[PDB]
Amino acid sequence: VFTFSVGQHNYDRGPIQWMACENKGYYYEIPSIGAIRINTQEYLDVLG
Amino acid sequence: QNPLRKACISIVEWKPFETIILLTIFANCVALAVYLPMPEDDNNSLNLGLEKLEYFFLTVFSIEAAMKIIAYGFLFHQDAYLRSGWNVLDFIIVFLGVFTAILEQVNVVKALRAFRVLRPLRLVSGVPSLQVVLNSIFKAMLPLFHIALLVLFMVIIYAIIGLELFKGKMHKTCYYIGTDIVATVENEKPSPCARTGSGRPCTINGSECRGGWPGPNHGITHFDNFGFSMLTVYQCITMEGWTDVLYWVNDAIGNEWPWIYFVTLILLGSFFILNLVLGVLSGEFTKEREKAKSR
Amino acid sequence: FYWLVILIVALNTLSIASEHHNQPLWLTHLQDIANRVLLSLFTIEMLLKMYGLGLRQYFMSIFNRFDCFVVCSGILELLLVESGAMTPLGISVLRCIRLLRLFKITKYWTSLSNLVASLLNSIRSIASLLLLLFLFIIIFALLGMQLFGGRYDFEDTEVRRSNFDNFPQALISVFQVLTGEDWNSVMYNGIMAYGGPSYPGVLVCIYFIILFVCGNYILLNVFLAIAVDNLAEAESLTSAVNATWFTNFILLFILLSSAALAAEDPIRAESVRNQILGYFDIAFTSVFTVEIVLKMTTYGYFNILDLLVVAVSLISMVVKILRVLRVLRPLRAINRAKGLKHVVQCVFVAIRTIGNIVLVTTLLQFMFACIGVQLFKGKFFSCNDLSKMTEEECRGYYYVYKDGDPTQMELRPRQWIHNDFHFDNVLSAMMSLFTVSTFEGWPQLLYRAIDSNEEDMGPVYNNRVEMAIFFIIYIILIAFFMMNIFVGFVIVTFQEQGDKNQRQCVQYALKARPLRCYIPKNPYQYQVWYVVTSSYFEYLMFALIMLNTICLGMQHYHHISDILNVAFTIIFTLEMILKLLAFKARGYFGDPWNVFDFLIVIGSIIDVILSEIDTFLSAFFRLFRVMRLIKLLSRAEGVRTLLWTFIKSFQALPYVALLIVMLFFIYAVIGMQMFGKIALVDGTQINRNNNFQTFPQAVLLLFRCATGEAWQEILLACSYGKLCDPESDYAPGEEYTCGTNFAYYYFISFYMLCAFLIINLFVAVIMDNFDYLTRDWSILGPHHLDEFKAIWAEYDPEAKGRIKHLDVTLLRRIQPPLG
Amino acid sequence: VFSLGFLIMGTICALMAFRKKRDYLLRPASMFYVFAGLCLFVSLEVMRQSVKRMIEYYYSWSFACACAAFVLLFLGGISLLLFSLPRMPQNPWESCMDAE
Amino acid sequence: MSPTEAPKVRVTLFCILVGIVLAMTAVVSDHWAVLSPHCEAAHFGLWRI
Ligand SMILES: CCCCCCCCCCCCCCCCCC(=O)OC[C@H](COP(=O)([O-])OCC[N+](C)(C)C)OC(=O)CCCCCCCCCCCCCCCCC
Ligand SMILES: CCCCCCCCCCCCCCCCCC(=O)OC[C@H](COP(=O)(O)OCCN)OC(=O)CCCCCCCCCCCCCCCCC
Ligand SMILES: CCCCCCCCCCCCCCCCCC(=O)OC[C@H](COP(=O)(O)OCCN)OC(=O)CCCCCCCCCCCCCCCCC
Ligand SMILES: CCCCCCCCCCCCCCCCCC(=O)OC[C@H](COP(=O)(O)OCCN)OC(=O)CCCCCCCCCCCCCCCCC
Ligand SMILES: COC(=O)C1=C(C)NC(C)=C([N+](=O)[O-])[C@@H]1c1ccccc1C(F)(F)F
Ligand SMILES: [Ca+2]
């Protein structure tokens, strides 16, 4: 499970990190358009 | 009114029910403030709990009303209760409360939840000191009548003047050529333009002055009808962003005349009227003090 | 000891007011060992004066009740860092308490202790009327969470920090709308959150119209019922060539040299206007260089003023100060103007009064500057793009997306930018707090401070939402409280240079004179006079005026709007000729309101004629149909009274407004010289609409800064970095050289002066009319005597002196307060 | 033409007012002069756009003449009015529209 | 005479008279505009050029 927390908000992010860490996955944050490219290609480090 | 047939509850009405209702309203306020408004009809667990807490705050405030409506007359019996100044306000709060919380359980709208924000007012009925204070600031404006009646007509006169002069003038702007992308620079808010006139002409490279643009502030600041002219005049009167309106009228119709309209609106409307109001209030504070010092 | 103790406190003040960002290590040492010696010196102070003034007199007096708290905390804070006090934010507030210890000692002086017995009682007695104001803000915060809570779901990338998403944010937004700062931006977000500028969406303007009007009115009964009750009782307790042919012409030759100084060309160093004005230069120098001799060889502070003015104008036939030092030409007017001397002297002696409250606000603002440095020092840096957080990362280039579109981008070099109003040293903190006090751009600083992350790191959205309190307590003290007891100061002071009733009555009855009425003979037109002054006719014309107004408003953008104007023009000109058929044209113009209506009927006629001539083969003549509704004012006797009471007093104190006009003149000329070669680039604050090229543009800019528009952005728009105008005369490659740091002195000074004068100007006009405001309309007054005059003139139509004895019946047309 | 007409009508009342103690007649005439000026002003307006609807140009002799004439008439008529209209009362017993 | 033959009325009507003469002379005179697309300098008036 790779979980992405998109946007700039105040909602809690604990559970989403847990979902990512409890399921052999990873947790990414995408706050703007500039972060999209580098955060959407970075799961191929976990897959390898 | 009637005998002591039902009025076996007025016995407690004079107990320390001050604290029991003050704290209940205070907890209602705190439960109103921890609510978290979510968009597009989402929700979270907590909000769904603070509604299962509204029938607990809309019950206490209803039985503490059916405890006083049967302890004074048939309803009032002399126009006492509902004609008591504040006890009718509490009754209206408990009226809209149950009315709206029942109307919601019928079509199982949300705008009806907005009368729920009056419940903090029952604190001013709670203590007496705030009753006498809220009755002072309502008596200090009996003299401020003529000044408000002089401001209401200056806003109305300036709305009509601006409606005559600048109606439908801020509607063209510098678009990119053959495109619907308004052309600006880094910190420039989109201002009007003029092709073959006296207003400002487009200076961005590939840009043209063309019409069919709603207006400066997403279509809110303009003198296109009476409502919007009143809105923008009132906004300049409070001296907030009046220079933006001036600069936009400059950019549309020309540089030399329009300042008379605004420099005079800010001198008369803002400084003069504020002077009047300060004078009329201190002339009422010093008088009441010279009368209450004599006690 | 009374002065060694203050030497101690001054050393401690200077040790606290030198903590800046990136200080040298020796300064850190000098400070960390200079408080230790003063802590060990304040340890013995509560042991010696516990021995000289007895022991139990350390607690029965409030003054030194805390000097033990000073050290009790000092020692406590001295051993917390070295045990567990991590969180530099928490360590930063430990040094704040230190500031409190300095405050108790500084306060000693009679003037600085006599007022807390009044100021503290002002707050503590009236802390119940503060509760209603806090409850107003708490109701409107909740109402905003309802209306706009979670409705700012805009699909762009523009950041709208002032929203209503949760309770602290809604409280911040409502507070900002109360102070008035940028409330219109919040309104536009609210109107776009709903549909748009359509029918149901614009109705949420109301929330912002009642919150600003009814919320700024409780702030007149809160912070200004304090400085009319709890500052008046405080002072009440403390109570317990000599012709008109030459001098009146040489005065007139200052008003010409000054206007020649105004209309100059600062851009082109040598123009025809400058070449032409260079002759009036020598003329206006020479005359006053040959008019000092007549006034100093015939005779023996004010004329040396003139001689310096003419000396600087002669040595000008670096050297650039010669052209700024010449701008004090309008100040020799006070020399010959006798009417203006007496107002400038009141302005000079109005300052001995404000030195006790103006020095308590600067010390209060200096207390907050050091707290601000303790909190926000170094934290106001940022990167161009908010993804890099240290200066080592904020290098290179990055993409920006126009309109928020991921396929339309641009390369920008990213740079580690420091804010413009930061809090690094106490001078910068003091400048920032100054701009916050005038309410301008304070939410930008608030949100820059809520996001402050660490010492050399960039911002973290919504990090410390409690740092709002710092900005909201300051604003409550300085801008709302001290700025109100200072005005109350001025008011109750002017109350001294400003019984009664019997006096004014006997002067009224003695000086007053009865009225004219122009009652006619010749019944043919007596008939028409009987209807002209009937209540039916008067209460018909008001209806016609209201209907005219409603017709004038019904128009909109995209004919009937003209024929109806023809109709109303006709109806009013017929009433004018119908009244001339009654007042014989001699009693008609005797009444000013009738002259004023005659002035509008002609304007309307010309209006319609010009419209029809344009259509048959002047956009401002259309204001005559609009002014018709101003003559609704012959009936609103209360409102007309209220207008005359203040016009008579603006027409009585013009020499004070002359001060404001001279201030604008001097400052506009100085600024036209200093920063007048800056380029007019759009997207900045020195642009085509707001610049210093000509004289009207400079005066409009100054008037904009007086109102409190973004005067700090204009201040930053001219400070030695500014591309020079192309038409200017300057060395090549010397482009980025226009603008001066003198700007910081120019604006900060202007504002203060202009904020001062205006206040002055308000209270004069107020106190000048203090009879009308502080008046009972129930016991007596000049209104009763005016009504007596009315019933008199009813029986004696023309004045012609006084009337026959009996028709003594009038005591039935008399109100009981008179008979 | 309209401005000249106003000048003539204002001069009528201005002449016939210095005699017979018909002082009040200074109140109408004044405003006539005012309106005179105003009309000349809008002429300028017209002329302005004319010189733009047709190259270099220049206002030399009678445009300054008209500008000055309009300003003279305008300020002079308003000053005649404020010098004829009795007075801002300035005292609670003083009052406009009074006797002498 | 107080609002008629005081000085300020006479000086103000002298101002009016100068305005009148400048106005009656600034009408028929063709002395305020020129043009040359560019030696053909035209000259404007109120009726004919
Ligand atoms: C009830 C209590 C009383 C409260 C109200 C009391 C005050 C009354 C309000 C006064 C309004 C102020 C005058 C309006 C300003 C005109 C703006 C303007 O002209 O620009 C737009 C317009 C721009 O339109 P435009 O037509 O130029 O635009 C297109 C360009 N052309 C012309 C080529 C087609 O200006 C004009 O139309 C030209 C005429 C301007 C000349 C007006 C100046 C004199 C106006 C009256 C004088 C009074 C002074 C101010 C009031 C005095 C009171 C202290
Ligand atoms: C002590 C004082 C307290 C008193 C309380 C006063 C508070 C009230 C102040 C707020 C007034 C603001 C009014 C805002 C609404 C104005 C009307 C409006 O919004 O409509 C504009 C409308 C646009 O039309 P549009 O939509 O383009 O038409 C196409 C339709 N498919 O175009 C229109 O049709 C608008 C036409 C309306 C024009 C009316 C002009 C009013 C002038 C009246 C002057 C007298 C005032 C009343 C006298 C009172 C005496 C005491
Ligand atoms: C009631 C209680 C409170 C009272 C507060 C007291 C404050 C009083 C002070 C108010 C000051 C208001 C000043 C506003 C006038 C500014 C004039 C203006 O902004 O016009 C701009 C316009 C630009 O023209 P231009 O320079 O040609 O630029 C385009 C390229 N050429 O210019 C033009 O094109 C037309 C030029 C006409 C301007 C005539 C007047 C210019 C001089 C300003 C008048 C004020 C007196 C000067 C100094 C004292 C000002 C107070
Ligand atoms: C303590 C109380 C303080 C008093 C303030 C409260 C006053 C209440 C205001 C009444 C407003 C009622 C509006 C009536 C309904 C209008 C109907 C409407 O839909 O008009 C919208 C109008 C433009 O029409 P629109 O529909 O957008 O046209 C395009 C296609 N529809 O767009 C609009 O904006 C219409 C509404 C205009 C709002 C006018 C705002 C200025 C008037 C307030 C200034 C008065 C200041 C008084 C100062 C007193 C001093 C003490
Ligand atoms: C004059 O006005 C001005 O300028 C001001 C501003 C607004 N700002 C600031 C900050 C300040 N300071 O600081 O100072 C001031 C004040 C405020 C309040 C109160 C008082 C005061 C004084 F002045 F007295 F001191
Ligand atoms: Ca502002």
In whole angstroms, what is the distance from residue E5 CA to residue C105 CA?
A: 73
Partners of residue D56 on adjacent β-strands: E36
Q: Is C794 marked as a binding-site residue?
A: no
Instruction: Establish whether residue C48 lines the binding site of ligand 5, counting it when its CB lies within 6 angstroms of any ligand atom.
Output: no
Closest chain C C-alpha to A37 CA, distance in angstroms:
11
We report the CATH number of the domain holding residue C139 as 1.20.120.350
Q: D30 near D84, Cβ under 8 Å?
A: yes
Query: Helices C167-178 & C468-477, crossing angle to 10 degrees?
Result: 30
Q: Is B29 within 8 Å of C184 when comparing Cβ atoms?
A: no
Same domain as C131, residue C109: no
Does residue B34 sit at the C interface (CB-CB below 8 Å)?
yes
Closest chain D C-alpha to C567 CA, distance in angstroms:
22
Partners of residue A26 on adjacent β-strands: A2
Using H for helix, E for strand and C for coil, what is the string for C728-758?
Answer: CCCCCCCCCCECCCCHHHHHHHHHHHHHHHH
We report the CATH number of the domain holding residue C4 as 1.10.287.70
Closest chain A C-alpha to C689 CA, distance in angstroms:
35
What method did the depositors use to determine the structure? cryo-EM
Same domain as C63, residue C146: no
Which residues of chain C lie closer than 8 angstroms to B238, CB-CB?
A: 180, 183, 212
Cβ neighbours for C193, distance < 8 A, ≥ 6 positions apart: C148, C151, C152, C153, C154, C204
Instruction: Establish whether residue B258 lines the binding site of ligand 1, counting it when its CB lies within 6 angstroms of any ligand atom.
Output: yes
Q: B114 near C143, Cβ under 8 Å?
A: yes
Which residue is closest in CA terms to ligand 1's atom 14? B261
Closest chain C C-alpha to B244 CA, distance in angstroms:
10
Closest chain C C-alpha to B23 CA, distance in angstroms:
16
Q: Is D62 within 8 Å of E20 when comparing Cβ atoms?
A: no
Dihedral in degrees, nearest 10, Cα atoms D47, D53, D58, D60: -20
| Residue owning tokens 């009226």 | B95
Chain C to chain D Cβ contacts (< 8 Å): 71
Token pair recorded at residue B139: 């008596």
Which residue is closest in CA terms to ligand 4's atom 11? C206
Residue C349 CA to ligand 5 centre (angstroms) = 18
DSSP letter assigned to residue C195: S
Domain holding C88, by residue range, is 1-121
Token pair recorded at residue C56: 């139990």
Option in C507, C609, C799 nearest D99 (CB): C799
Q: C163 near B54, Cβ under 8 Å?
A: no
Residue C570 CA to ligand 1 centre (angstroms) = 24
Q: Which residue of D has its CA nearest to E23?
A: D69
Instruction: Establish whether residue C214 lines the binding site of ligand 4, counting it when its CB lies within 6 angstroms of any ligand atom.
Output: yes
Same domain as C115, residue C1: yes
Output b/e per residue, B134-165; b: 16+ Cβ within 10 A.
beebeebbeebebbeebbebbbbbbbbbbbbb
Same domain as C92, residue C67: yes
- In the Cβ-directed half-sphere of C176, how many Cα atoms lie within 13 Å? 29
Q: Which residue of E has its CA nearest to D85?
A: E3
In whole angstroms, what is the distance from residue D92 CA to residue C506 CA?
A: 12
Type of residue found at B234: Y
Q: C210 near C220, Cβ under 8 Å?
A: no
Q: Do chains E and A touch (3 or more CB pairs under 8 A)?
A: no
Which residues of chain D lie closer than 8 angstroms to C513, CB-CB?
A: 93, 98-100
Report how far apart, in Å, the C-alpha atoms of B184 and of each of B61, B181, B208, B211 are: 57, 9, 12, 16
Q: Is A33 within 8 Å of C404 when comparing Cβ atoms?
A: yes
Nearest atom in ligand 5 to the alpha carbon of residue C362 is 13
Same domain as C163, residue C88: no
Q: At how many Å resolution was this determined?
A: 3.2
Q: Is E32 within 8 Å of D47 when comparing Cβ atoms?
A: yes
Does residue D55 sit at the C interface (CB-CB below 8 Å)?
no
Option in A10, A31, A34 nearest C398 (CB): A34
| Residue owning tokens 């008019």 | C291
Same domain as C37, residue C102: yes
DSSP letter assigned to residue C128: T
In whole angstroms, what is the distance from residue C520 CA to residue D97 CA?
A: 17
Same domain as C114, residue C158: no
Same domain as C226, residue C144: yes
Touching partners of E (3+ C-beta pairs < 8 Å): D
Does residue E49 sit at the D interface (CB-CB below 8 Å)?
no
Type of residue found at C177: V
Q: C41 near C8, Cβ under 8 Å?
A: yes
Report how far apart, in Å, the C-alpha atoms of B238 and of each of C312, C337, C567, C643, D25 are: 44, 37, 37, 21, 43
DSSP letter assigned to residue C482: I
Cβ neighbours for C351, distance < 8 A, ≥ 6 positions apart: none
Using H for helix, E for strand and C for coil, what is the string for chain B?
Answer: CCCCCCCCCCCCCCCCHHHHHHHHHHHHHHHHHCCCCCHHHCCCHHHHHHHCCHHHHHHHHHHHHHCCCCCCCCCCCCCCCCCCCCHHHHHHHHHHHHHHHHHCCCCCCHHHHHHHHHHHHHHHHHCCHHHHHHCCCCCCCCCCHHHHHHHHHHHHHHHHHHHHHCCCCCCCEEEECCCCCECCCCCCCCCCCCCCCCCCCCCCCCEEEECCCCCCCCCCCCCCCHHHHHHHHHHHHCCCCHHHHHHHHHHHHCCCCCHHHHHHHHHHHHHHHHHHHHHHHHHHHHHHHHHHCCC
Option in D86, D92, D98 nearest C782 (CB): D92
Same domain as C15, residue C104: yes
Closest chain C C-alpha to D1 CA, distance in angstroms:
13
Q: Do chains C and D touch (3 or more CB pairs under 8 A)?
A: yes
Task: Among the bound ligands, name the one nearest to the CA of residue C439.
Answer: 6
Q: E1, E2, E4, E35: which to substitute to probe chain D, counting the most D Cβ within 10 Å? A: E4
Same domain as C204, residue C147: yes
Task: Among the bound ligands, name the one nearest to the CA of residue C474.
Answer: 5
Cβ neighbours for C557, distance < 8 A, ≥ 6 positions apart: B167, B168, B224, B225
Same domain as C145, residue C109: no
Q: Is A10 within 8 Å of C462 when comparing Cβ atoms?
A: yes
Q: A6, A9, A10, A28: which to substitute to probe chain C, counting the most C Cβ within 10 Å? A: A10
Largest CA distance in chain C: 108
Does residue C517 sit at the D interface (CB-CB below 8 Å)?
no
Which residue is closest in CA terms to ligand 4's atom 14? C203
In whole angstroms, what is the distance from residue B86 CA to residue B122 CA?
A: 8
Cβ within 8 Å of B, C 118-137: 128-129, 131-132, 135
Which residue is closest in CA terms to ligand 4's atom 35? B227
Output b/e per residue, C248-263; b: 16+ Cβ within 10 A.
eebeeebeebbebbbe
Q: Is C727 marked as a binding-site residue?
A: no
Instruction: Establish whether residue C642 lines the binding site of ligand 4, counting it when its CB lies within 6 angstroms of any ligand atom.
Output: no
Q: Is D2 within 8 Å of C606 when comparing Cβ atoms?
A: yes
Nearest to C769 by CA among B143, B276, B141: B276
Does residue A9 sit at the C interface (CB-CB below 8 Å)?
no
Can you say how many angstroms the Cα of residue B2 is from the centroid of all Cα atoms in its chain?
44
Nearest atom in ligand 2 to the alpha carbon of residue B156 is 42
| Backbone φ/ψ region at C633: left (φ over 0), alpha (ψ -120 to 50), beta | alpha
Q: Is D40 within 8 Å of E20 when comparing Cβ atoms?
A: no
Same domain as C204, residue C189: yes
Using H for helix, E for strand and C for coil, what is the string for D19-54?
Answer: CCCCHHHHHHHHHHHHHHHHHHHHHHHHHHHHHHCC
Q: Is B283 within 8 Å of C774 when comparing Cβ atoms?
A: yes
Does residue C643 sit at the D interface (CB-CB below 8 Å)?
no
Question: Phi, psi (5° rounding) for residue C103?
Answer: -60, -40
**DSSP alpha helix (H) spans, C214-340:** 215-222, 232-238, 247-250, 254-262, 272-289, 293-296, 303-315, 320-324, 333-336
Question: Phi, psi (5° rounding) for residue C785?
Answer: -70, -35
Cβ within 8 Å of D, C 273-332: none
Q: C774, C775, C783: which to substitute to probe chain B, counting the most B Cβ within 10 Å? A: C774
Cβ within 8 Å of C, B 108-167: 113-114, 116-118, 120-121, 123-124, 129-130, 133-134, 136-137, 140-141, 145-147, 149-150, 153, 156-157, 159-161, 163-165, 167
